[PDB]
Amino acid sequence: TMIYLCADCGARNTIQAKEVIRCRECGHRVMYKMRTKRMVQFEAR
Amino acid sequence: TMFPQEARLRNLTYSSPLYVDMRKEDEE
């Protein structure tokens, strides 16, 4: 499974598939996703 | 309690509960 990030704290929640959506050392229950690596092809125009 | 707009996206409806004192008799 992967890592997720909370809306406020941002700490690594690294939480497991099929469980409960929340955090660890805090509160609130949302979370976005770390940006991939990832060297991405971008024209300057 | 709710904290919008951190709600919304949880498709949550933003209401509060009503509480009306009902009378049946036990004083309170």
Ligand SMILES: [Zn+2]
């Ligand atoms: Zn958090």
